[model samples]
Target: IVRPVADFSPSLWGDQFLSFSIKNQVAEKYAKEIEALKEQTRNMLLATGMKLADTLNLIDTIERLGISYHFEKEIDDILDQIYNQNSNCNDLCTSALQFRLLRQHGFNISPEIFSKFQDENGKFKESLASDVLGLLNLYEASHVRTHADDILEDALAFSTIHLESAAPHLKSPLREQVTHALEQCLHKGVPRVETRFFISSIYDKEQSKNNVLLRFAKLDFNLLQMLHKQELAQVSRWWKDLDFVTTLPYARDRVVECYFWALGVYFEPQYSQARVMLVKTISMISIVDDTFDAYGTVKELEAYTDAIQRWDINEIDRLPDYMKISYKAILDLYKDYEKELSSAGRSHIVCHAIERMKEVVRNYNVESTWFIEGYTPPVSEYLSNALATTTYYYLATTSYLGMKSATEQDFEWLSKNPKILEASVIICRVIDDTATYEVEKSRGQIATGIECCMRDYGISTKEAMAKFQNMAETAWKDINEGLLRPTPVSTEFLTPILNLARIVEVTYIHNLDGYTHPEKVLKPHIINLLVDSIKI
Candidate 1:
C-alpha cells in the first residue's frame, strides 16, 4: 500500500478555461483591437522607459507581465545606455531598480552602488526607514547578491526585519506591497501569473500616477493571455489523451501543473511547441520519479533503470507490469522527439536529450539503492549525484529541444556542464529539500541535502537548511556570471537556464512545494493565466 507523508486527492483534470469549439470566435473577437498595442508600448517607453531607473522598473514590469518579447530591442537599447551611463542611483527606488535590471541583463554591477543609503555605522540609514519605497525596493534588489556582497547581505537582513515590522501597521497599496515583498520578493515570484494580480491589484495601487505604463501592463497582459489561452488549449489537449491518471494511477497526475512548469520556462508564443514537448517530458518525469520513490521495489527499480539505460523497446518486457506502459511510452517519446529534430536537420538533439533522460533514471537508482541499502551518503557525494536528479540539466536538454533558435553549437555548449545549470540545480536542490524534506522523511525518503549536510557537518536541521540556503544564494552569483555579456552562449541560449532558476523561485519560494500539491498552487494559477481574461 502507498503511504504519503501528507497527500491530497488530485483535484483538477483537463479543465479548459475557454472551450476549443469557440476558440475561433475567441481569436476573431480580439484580433482587430488586440493587434495594435505596440505603439502604446513604444509610446509608453519613449514617454517613460528612457530614464535609467524608470526603464529598469519598466523592464522588470514587462518581464513580470510576460511581454518582454514584444519590445526586446527597446529594452536592450535602454538597459545598455543606462549601463554605459554608469552613475549611481539618486533615490532608493532608482538605485534598487537599476541594480536588479542591470545585473539581470548580465551587466556586472558592483554591489557598492547600494551603499549610499547606509549610515556611517555600515548599517542602512535609519532615516531611510520612513520611505517604504526605498526599503521595499532595496529588499527586492538585494537578492541579486554575489559572493562576499556583505553589504547587500546586511542590507537584506536589515531591510527584511524592518519591512516585516513595517508591514503590519501600514495602509493599503504600500502595506500590500510591503507584505507581499516580505513574503515573496520579485526575484522569487512567478511572473505572468503574479503579474496578473500585480498589474491591477498591486502595480496600480502602488504607482497610480503612472497611467501610461499601467495601461500597457493591462493591455499587454490581456494580449498575451489570448496567446497563452490558445497555447494552453493545445497543450491540455495532449494531456487529456495521455491520461496519466488512468494509465499510471500511482503517479502524481499533475499534467496541468507540469505544463505550467514549462510555461514558466518560456512564456512566448514562439516557444509554444517547445513548452508542449517539455511538459510532456516532465509530466512523465514526475510520474517516473514517483514510481521509483513511492511505488517501485528494489528489484523493480533496478530493472527499470537497466531498461532505460539500454534505450531498447524490447527491454520493457523485463520490467514489471506497471513499468511496461511507461517504458514503452518513454521509448516512443525519444523516437518522436528525435524525428522532429531530424526533420529540422538537428537530429543530434536526441543524443543528448536521450542521455539526459537516462541520467535521470541513473540518479533515481542512486537514491533507490541508498533507500534499499539504508545508507546515507555524505553531503558532497550526495550532491554530485543529486544534480542529475534535480532535473535542471534534464530540462536544459529538453526545453530547447526542436527550437529553431538553438543551434548545434548551442547544443554542444549545453552538453558541457554549464555553471548556470549547476547553479540552478543548487537552488532547486536546496529549496526543494527545505520545503519537502520532511515529507520525504515521512515516506522513508533517502538522505536529502538536508540529511546529508546534517550528517556531514554534525548540525541540527535548522543549521543545515540555513547553510543550504546560503549555498543556494551564493550559487546564484554563478548563474549571474553565466548570464553576463561576452558569454559562452547567447541570451536565447541562456534564457532557458535562467528560467529554470526562476521556476525554482516560483515553485518553492514560499516553501509551499507546489509540485506536491498542484491543487493548492497550480490550480488557481492555471485558472488565472488561462481562464480569467484581464479586463483592459
Candidate 2:
C-alpha cells in the first residue's frame, strides 16, 4: 500500500529547515543586489543613448555569468535593474527582452516592481502596451505556457490605469495557439462531450463581448439579400476566382480561425449547442467543398447549386450514381439520427437542436460558389475540426468500455472468447491504425486508440498492447474453430460500432496508397462478425 506524505506545517521549518533557510538567504541577498543594479542601469540610460547597446550587452553578460555561477542574488539584481530601466531602451526589442527577463524572475521580485513601471496616472501607458503585446507574441511563438487570465488581467489593469484603449489584436496563428492551449488545459479529466458544452458557453460569452452576433446577423441578412437577388452566384464566382494566398483579409481569416477553433473544441457530447453549431457550419462548408470537388469552374458549381435549390435532385440523379448515393446517404444519415434520438431517453435536447439545424440547412439557398469564393473557414477551423473529431471518436469507444455496466471481468471474458474478441480487436486495430495514419500524415494529431484504451483501463501502453495481441491471437484461433458468437446485447451495439469500423476502413483504404486489396484484407472478418453479431 502506498502511503501519503505528511503535510508540512509552518512550525516544522522552525527546528530543521536547512533548505528553507538557504533559499530565503539567497532570495534576500538577490533582492538587495538587484535593487543596486537597477539604480545603476537607470542612471546609465539617462546619461547616454550611445550606452544603450553597451548597457544591453553588459546586462546579457551579467545574466549569463549569474546563471553559470548560480548566483541567485546577481540574477535577481539583473532582472530588477533591466526592468527599472526598460523604458529607457531605444528599441521595442530591447524593452520586450528586458520585460521577459523580469517576468522570468518574477517569483523573486515584489509585485510593486511591476506597479512602479506604470505611468503617473497608474496605467500601462501607450509604449508599454506595444511592448506587452510584443512580449505576448514572443511567448506564444515559443509555445511557453503562461497564465493567460492573469496576463489579461494585468493588461486590463494597465489599460485602466493608463486610460488607454485595449483591444485584442491577436493574429490568426496566435489566436489559434491560445485557443488550442485553452482547450488542452481546461478539457483534461473532463468528459470529451461535456467539454464541448463549456466551449459553447465560452464562445457565447466571447460573441456577446465582441458583438460578433450582431455582425453575424448583419452579414447573414446581406447574404440572404444577395441570394434573393440571384446576384450572389456572380459575386461568389468573382471572389472564388481571386487567389486567397494573395488576397485574403488577415483579420477576417483570424476571426474565422477563432470560430473554427471554438467549434473544434466543443464538437463532442454534452456541448450540444456548440456541436450543433459546428455541424451546421460544417454542413454549410460541405456544400462548397462538394461543389469544388465535383465541378472545376465556379459557373458549373453555380449551376449545380441552382439545380439543388430548384429541388431537382432527379436532374443530377441520372448523371452519376455516386452523386445520388452521396445525396441519399446524407439524408438517410440525418433521418437515422433522428430516429435514434427519438428512441433514446434524455436525448430530446440533441434531437431538437438537430431539427433546428435541418430546418436551417433546408431553408438556406445560397449558391455554393458564394462560399467557395467569399468565405474562408480559417486555418484554425480546419485544424480544430480534424483534431477534435479525431479525439472525440477515439475517446468515445474507449469510454464505452468503462461505463457503469462495463467491468474488468467483462473485458476478460470478451478476450477469452477467441472469435468474438478477434473480430472486435480487428475493428479496433483498423480504427487505431487509420487515426494514426492521418495524424502521421499531418492531417491531424490525436492520441492513439491503444493509448486511449490503456488510459481507460488504468494500464500502461505496453501492458495493454501485450494483452490485446494475446487476445487477437486467441480470437483468430476461435475464428478458425468456428467458435465465434455474439450475445444479444452485443448485437444491438454492434451496428454503430461496425459502422464506425467501416468508416475507419474506408479512410485507411483511400488515404494509404501502398495498401492494396482492402476488401480481401477486411472482408472475411467483417462478414464473419456481421453474420454472427446480427440475427437474420
Candidate 3:
C-alpha cells in the first residue's frame, strides 16, 4: 500500500473535440425535409394496418434506434388497441416479437401465447431450437420477464444454451446477430446508439424487410445523431466556459461522458433541451462526488455540504473559493429550472428536483465523513446510506424534470420511494461497488458495498462478491415485478428508472467500472454511436 494516492490527472479530451458551432439556420431547414419524410412513412405504416405484426416490428425498430419519443402517443394508441391479442403470428418468431413489444408498452401481455410451440412434456419443443431467428427473438423477449413467469425463465435458459452452441455455424449477419444477443439482450444492452448500427446492418442484408421503413429509420438516426452533436457542443461550451479543470483541478472532468450517461435516460431529438440540462446536472454530480471523495478536506466538505443543504445563493459566501464556484453553479442550475417551469405553470417540479439534489449532497457528506475518519459501518447500516450515493434517484428526478409531461404528481410518486426506483438504486450501487471495490479499497475510499459486505459476513472478497451479485439479481427481479399491470407510477416516470438500471448493467456487468475507466469499452461505444454515421 505504498503511496496509494494514484493522483489521477486532468482532462484527456481537448476543447476541439467538443467544439462545434450550431448551424441552427441550416438545421431548421433540413428538419422540415425530415418531417416530410417522417409523415410519408407514418402514412405507409397506417396503410399497412398499424397493429399488424409487421407494423409492430417497425415500432420495435424505431424504439431500438432511440427515436420513439417523437411518436409516443401514436405508438401508444396502436399498442393499446392490440392489448391482450397475443397471437400476432403463427410461428414463434412473430409471436415473441409481438409479446415483448406489447408488454414493454405496459400492455398485460400473456406468455400463454407461446404455448403453441411447447411439447407434450411442456418444454419448448426440441425441433424449434434450431430455428435461429425464432430462438433469437425468444431470447430478447425473455429479458422482460416478471418474477412469476416460469416459462420465460425457462425460455431464457433454453435460448441462451442453444444460441451459444449454434452461433458459430451461422451465415454472415445471422452469426453476428446471435453473437451480440448472447453478449447482452437488446433490452439489457447499452442505449440505442451502436445497436442501431448493428440492427441496420443486419436488416440491410435482408431484402424481404420493408425498404421504406428501413430507409426512414436510417435517416431518422442520422438526423438525431447530428442534433446530439450540436447539443454536446452547447453543453461543452457551458463546461469549458466554467474552466472547472483549471479552476478546480481536484475534481473529475468528464463532461463528454456525463452527456452520454444522460443519453441513456432519453436520447430522442425532442428531448434535446432536457439532455443538455441533465448532462450539465450530472456533470456537476461527478464533480461534487470527486470533490468529496478525493480533494476536499473534512473542514471544506463540511462547509460545502452544509451550504448545499441550505440551497440558497446567499450562503455561497460561507464556502471556500473552489466550493463557492461549484455552489453558484448548482444554485444557478436550480434557479434556471425554476424560471422555465414557472413560466410553464409547473413550478412545483423545481422544489422537488432540487430537494432530491440536496439529499444527494447530504449523502456525499456522510461518505466524506467516513473517509475523513477512516471508519467503515456494518453492511446493514452501510446499505441504507449507500442507496442515496448511487445518485440514481437524483439523476432520475432530474432527467424527467424537463419532459413535456413532467408534473408535480410524478415528483410526488418518486418521493414516495417506489419499488422500481429502489430497484434502480440497488443495481447502480451494487454494480459500482463490484467494479470498484478493490481500487477504492486501495485508494482509501469508504462507502463501497464490497468491503462492507466482506466484513459483515465474515468471508473473503470473492464470497462477499457472491452476496452482492445475489443482491443485484434480486434487484432485477424487483424491477420486473414493478413493471407489472397497475404499476404505481406512470410509464413515462418509470422509463428513466428502468433505463438507468439497463445502463448500469451495461456499465458494470463484469467487475469493470465503465464510467470511471471509460476508455476501455465505453469510449469505443461512444464513438461508434455518436460520432460515426451508419452507411445506407
Candidate 4:
C-alpha cells in the first residue's frame, strides 16, 4: 500500500486569496462608469460613414483593448457589412488586417487576398520589407491559415524574417507590437492575457490613443479583476472548506490556478458561473489524477476506476478512505451541476460531462497500469491514451456546462470527436508530455508519450522532444483551420475549446509546467487577472 508520492510543492498562495473581499460600493461605481463608457464606445462604433480601414482599425483597437466582448454584436454587424461590400484593399497593412479580422470572426476570406503582395515567383515582394506595420499584420494573419495555406506559410516566413530585422530599429509602441506579435501571434494568443499586454504596453503608450476607450478599458479591467477576485475568494473558501489540503494532501493545491485556467477559457463576466463550474471540475480531476497516479495500488486504481464508471454513491463503500473522499466530491460536484442546470432543463448536459470524466479516468487507469507493470508503450499507444489523460477533452466538454448557446447537439458534436477537439487534445497531450517528461521520468513514470517517442525512435530525449514540439505546432494549425467559417458549431461554442489550447500554450511554454510550478510561471498572471486592479 506504499504510495509514489511526487512530493509536490505546497501552494504558493496560502490564505492570501482567502483574505480577498471586494468592496461592493466601489464595484458598483465602477460598473456604472463602465456602462456609460460602453455607450460612448457603441456610439463611436455606429457613428456611420467610416472608411473601411478606419472601421477595421477601430474594431482592432476595441479588441486589443479587451472591450470587444462588450460589443460582439456591434463588431459582428460591422464585419458582416464589410464582408458583403466590396473592399478594394490596396495597402498591405489594411489588407492583412481586413483578412485577419474577417477570418478571425469566421468570415471565409481567401488567403488569395494576399496575392497582391506577392511577385511572379510567389515570394512576398522584397520591396515590401520596409513596411513594418504591414509585415506585423501579415505575420499575425498567417497564423490564422488553415491546411495548405502556402501563401500564408510564405507570408509567415517573409514577415517573420523582416520583423526580426526591423524590431531593433523601431521606436516604442510599434516596436513592442512587432516583438510581442513575433512571440505570440494574435490568432493564437490568449485573448485576456494579450489584452492586458496591449493595454499596458502598446495601446496605452500610443500617441494617438482614444482617451475615453482607454479610461473605460482601465476601469473595466479593474472592475472585472474585482469581480474575479470575489469569484476566487468564494472558490477559495470552498476549497478551504473542502479541506482537501488535509484530506488529499498528495494532490496539487491549485484551486487558484484552476480558476485562472477557467478564466483563460472564458474571461467575460457573463461566463462567471461557467468559470466556477469549470474550475471545480478541473480541481476534482486534479485530485482524481493524483489519487491514481501519486498513490493507490494498481488493484486500488482498478477498483477506483470501476467505481467511477459505475458512478453510484453506493460504490463508495468499496473504496479506501482517500478514494472515498475523491469519489464523493466527484459525485457531489455533478449533483451541484444537476441542481444548477436542471432548473433550465439542461441537466442532461451533466451526463455528457460525467461520461467524459469516466473516459479520462479510464485513460488514467491505462497509464497507471503501464507504469506499475514497467511496460514501455509505443509512442502511438501512449498518445492514444495520453490525449484523454491530458484532460483537454474532458475540460472542453465541461466548459460548455454554463454556456447559454450550448445545446445537446453541441455535446453530441463533442462526443463524435470533432477535428477541433482532436487537435486541442494533441496540443495538450504533446506539450504537456514534453514539459513534464523529466518530472515524470524522475518519478519513474517512464511510459510517458515523450519517453515512448524516444524509446520507439531510439533517439535522444532532445530529438524526441523536437518531434513532439513539431506535432504540437501542426496541431495548432488544425485548431486555426477548425476555427474558420462553416464550423460544426457556432464559434461561440468552439472558443472555449480553442482557449483550452491557449492555456496549454502559455502554461507549458518553454517546457515549464506552470501549473506545477506556479510561482515561477503562473503567479504573475494570477496576480494580474485576480489580485491587482489596473490603476485608472
Candidate 5:
C-alpha cells in the first residue's frame, strides 16, 4: 500500500484519468454542435451568391464563435445575396430560418450584421432600397436586446430615416403607416429597459411637428402594456430561479422596465397604484444591483446576503467599499420610506413589499452556490448592467430635485442627500449626452441653431419649432455642463450618458401637450435642453 504511487501510476490511471475524463466531457458537450454550426455556415454561403473567397472568409469568422461572441458571416451572406445579386428568391427567408435554428441551439446572432447592412448602400437594390430602410428601422427599434453600441446605432439610423422620410411627406398616409409600423416594432421588441428613452425621442419629434402625422406619433400604450407583460413574465422566471446568479441581470432589467412602464402609464394623472408599485419595485432592484456591482464575485454577494439574513449591519459594513456604500444607500432609502408610510397610516400596505425584498436577498445568499458554479453573465447582462448604472443617475437626480420641496414627514431620505443635488445635475448632464446628442448626430442632422426645419423634416409652425427647440436645449444643458462647471473636461462617459439625454429630450417633446395634462407648461429651456441632448 505504501509503495511509490509513481511506479503504479500508469496502471492506476488507465482510462479513469481526470484530464482525459474532462476532455471527453467537454467534447461530448460542444463538439457536435460546433461541427453542425460550421456545416450550416458552409451550406448557407454555397447556396447564396457569395464568391468562394468571401465564403471562406466567412467560414474563418464563424469558426471563432464562442459563448460570448457571434458569427457575423451569416448576416454578410444574407446581405450579399439580397443586395449584390439579381436573385429575388427570398434570401432573408433562409437567413431568418438559420437565425431561428441557431438561436434555438444557443447561438447569439450579432446585431453588427444589421448595422453593417445599414452602412453599406451598395448592398441594397434601388427597387428594394426602401424595404431595406424599413428593415433597418425595424432593427433599430427592436434589435437592441443585448448590445448598447448596436442599439444606439440602430436607434439613430431609424430616427434619421423617420425624420427624413416623414418630413418630406408629412401629409402622406404612407408616411403615417411607416411611423406606426416603426412604433409597433419598437414597442414589441426594442429592449424594454431603454423604451422610455426611445419613446422620449419620438415624443420630442412629434411635438415639434405641426404636421398631422407628427402629432399622431403618440406613445402606444397598448404596445407598452404588452411589453410590460413580457417583462413581468421574465421577472417571475428570474425570481423563481432563486439560486441562479445568472438571473441577476434579468432581474435588474425587469425592475427598470417595471419602473418605466409605471412612469409611462402614470406620468399622466390616472395610474397612481401602478406608479407606487413601480417606485417600490425600483427600490428593491436597486438594492440587489448594488450588491452585485459592489461585490465582484458571487461569493461576496452571498456573504452580504448572510449578513442581511442575520440582521447584522456590522457584517454589512465589512463588505467591500462599493458594496457598503450601495447597501447603506439602499437601506437608508427604504428606512426613510417606511417612516413615511407609518406616519401616513399606510404602513401595512407596504409591509409585504418590504418583506418580499428581504426574502429574495436571503434566499439568494443561501442557495447561490447550487445553481451553477463559476457563473458568468452573458452579453445581455452587460447591456442591462450598463442601463441600470445610467438609470441610477436619472433616479438620483430626480429624487434630489423632488426632495428639495418634499414635506419633512414624507421622505427624510430625500433630505439626507443634500450634496447629491449638484451631483445629480452633473450626472443628468452626462446621461443626456449619452442618450440624445450622439444618437441625433449619427443620423446626419445639423447640430446647431434654433430653427426647426419644418419643410426639411416635416415640422409646420413656429410654435412647434419653439417646442422642439426648448426640449432640445434642456437636454443639451443637462449634458454640456458648461453651466455646471467653470472649466469643462471631456470624458468617454459622455457617450452613453448622452444617449439617455436624447431619449429624455425626445419623450418630453412628443408628449408636450397631448399625452400629459393640458396645464403642464412646455418650458423653453427644457425644449432647448432636449434638442441639445440629441445633438451629437
Candidate 6:
C-alpha cells in the first residue's frame, strides 16, 4: 500500500483555546451597556421624518459597524419605504449609496439609476472621477451587480481605475477605505471580519466617528469575542478528546481553522450551537477528506466511502486503522447531534445534513478515482464533479440544522440545489483549486480544475487562472442575484450561504490557502475575532 503522503503543514494553533471562561461581572456590565446603547441606536434608526440621505448614511454606518442584525426590521422597513417612494438620487455618493443599500436589502433597484452620470459615448463622466467618496460608493455598488448589468460592468471598471489613481492622494479614513476596497470590496468580504476592520482601522480613526455607535460596536464586538472564545474552547476540548492529531496522524490538525470556517458561515451569538455543530462536521470533513486524499489506497478509499454510504457504526470494523478512526468519528458526531436535537424535536434536520455528506463522499470518491487512475478531465467534466467536492453544498445544508428559524422546507429548498448554493459551490471550488494548484501539482495531484482548465483550453497557467477568475466573478453576481427580493427562503437562511462565498473570497483572495497556511492571513483574522478585545 504505497500511499501518496503529501507534506501538509501542522496546525498553527495548538491548545491556546483550552482556557477561556468569561467573568460574570464583565459579561453582565457589557450586556447592560450594550442594551442601553442598542436602544439609543434603535431610536436613531426610527427617528421620524429623517432625510433620505441621513437615513441611508445611518443605516450604512450601522451595517458597517456590524450591528445591522440588531435592526433588520427597521432597516428593511426603511429601505422598503425608500424603494416605494422612488427617492431622488442626484449625486454619485447618494445615488450609488441608495442603489447599493436598496439592492443589498433585496430591492430590484436597476443599475440604470447610474446612467444619468454617463455620457452619450456610454462612458462614465470624467468629472465624477474626482468625487472620491462617490467613486468609492460606486465601486462598492458595482460588486452587487448581477448578469446583464452592462452599466455596472462599466461602472466597476470606471470606479476602480479612478479610485486606484486617487487613493494615494486621499487623506485619513477615506484613503484607508479606498485602499481596502481595492483590496476587497465590502460586498465580497466576510461580515464579521469587515466589521472588525471598520471598528478598529477605519471608523475609529475617523474624526467624527459616532461615539455611540463606535462605543456600542466595540463593546458588542468584545462581548461577542468572549462568547466566541468560549465556543472555541468547547470545540477545542472535543478535538483534544477525539485526539485525531495523535490517532489519525495523516490528517491536517486544523480544528481552530475549522471553527474559523464555521464562524465565517455564521458569527452572531444566536448561532452558537450551530457554530459548534458546524465545526464538528467541518473538522470531520477535513479528516475524511485527508483519509481519501492523502492516506487511503483506492481500494481502501472505496470501502470507506461505502461504509459512509451505509452510515452504520457497525461498518467501522470493515475499514483500515486510519479510516476506522474517521468513520467512527463521523457516526459518533451524528449520534450526538441526533440525541441533542431529538429533545427539541428537530433531529430530522440531521438526516438532511447526513444525506448531503453522503453525496459529498460520493464526489470525493470520484475525484479520488480520477487522481489514482491518472485521468486529467476536461474543465467542464471536472467542474461538474468538483463542484460537489468543494463541500459548500454540505456545509450550507448543515448550517441550517441549528437555526431556530430553519424549517423542513428550508432543507427541501436546499435539496433542490438553489442557484445561491450552486454559486457558493462554484466560488469555493474555483478559489480553492486555484489556491492549491501549485501545491497539488507539486505533489503529483492533477485533479484540480485549474490544471484541467489550463490543459483543456490549451492555455498557460496565468490565462487559465484569469478565465477561472471571471467564472468566480460571474458566480458572485449569481449569488448576488439569488439574494434579491422574493428569496426561496428567508434572507436569514440565505445569509450563511452568502457568508460561505465571502469566506472563499477572503480565504483564497491572493491565491493563498489561508485555511491551510493560517500563519499568513487567517492567523491575524483569528486573533482579531477570538483573542483581541476592542477598547472603548
- Choose the strongest candidate by lDDT: 6
Off-target runs (Cα >4 Å) in candidate 3 are 1-6, 22-33, 48-55, 65-67, 86-89, 115-123
lDDT tens per residue, model 2, 100-143: 34443432222233344446664444665555334343332221
The true-structure Cα RMSD of candidate 4 reads: 1.7
Model 3 C-alpha lDDT per residue in residues 1-536, reported as the tens digit of each score = 12124366455567655766556775675577668767876665456544466777777866765556667877887777677454445688888888788777767687787877787665898788888888999998888777666666578888888888899999877887788778768877766744575556676676466675566667667667788888888888888888888887777777888888888887776687678878988998888988887777778888898888777888988887878888898888777777877766876776777888889889888887777777778998897788998888889888887887877777888888888899889988888888888898877776567888877788998998888888887787788777766877677678788888988887775669877777775687677667786676
What tens digits encode model 6's per-residue C-alpha lDDT throughout 1-536? Answer: 77655687888777789889789899999999999999999999999988888899999999999888899898999999988988665798999999999988899987788888989877899899789988999999988888857777688889999999998889888899889999989988988899999999999999988899999999988888899999999999999999888888888889998888999888898999999999999999988888878788888888988998998988888888777777887888999999879878998789999999999999999998898788999988998888888888999998987887899998999999998899899989888887898899987788778889988999999999999888889898899899898888999998899999999989887889887778887888898888888767
Model 6 stretches astray by more than 4 angstroms:
2-6
Residue 96 Cα positional deviation in candidate 2, in Å, after optimal superposition: 18
Per-residue error at 344 for model 4, in Å?
1.8
In candidate 2, stretches whose alpha carbon ends up further than 4 angstroms from where it belongs are 1-117, 121-263, 267-288, 293-320, 345-536
| lDDT score of residue 10 within candidate 6 | 85
Question: Candidate 6: deviation at residue 344, Å?
Answer: 1.6
lDDT of 1 by residue, 1-536 (tens): 44434254673664743244435665564555445655666766767435566666767777765567778888888888788888874798888888888887778777788778887767888788778778887888887766646677677887888788788888787788788777677765666666876776677776444665666567667666677666667766666677766777777777667777888887777887788788888877887898887778888888999998998987878987778878887888877787777767876667788888899999999988887787789988998888889887898889888578787788888888878888887888888889998987876766777888888999999999999888887788788777778889888878788778888887775687887777666777777776777676
| Best candidate (score: TM-score) | 6
Tell me the tens digit of each residue's lDDT in model 5 across 1-536.
Answer: 12111110011111111111123453343444444554554455457566533443243223212111223455444544433443223333233233322322223444343333333542322232345334433333342233223323334454445445544445444354356545543322212223333333433344333232211112122222433334344443433343222432222323333334334322322233334444544545554644443334665676666665564456765676555654654565456555655654554434333444455565444323422343323323322222223343334322222122223332343223222222333333333333343333343322211112333344544543454455443434333332122212221122223333333433333333211221232222222211122221
Clash count of each predicted structure: 0, 10, 0, 0, 57, 0
Which residue runs of candidate 4 sit more than 4 Å off their true CA positions? Answer: 457-462
TM-score between model 1 and native: 0.91
lDDT of 4 by residue, 477-506 (tens): 788888877888988898998899888888
Model 5 lDDT, full chain set: 0.36
Model 5 lDDT-worst window of ten = 4-13
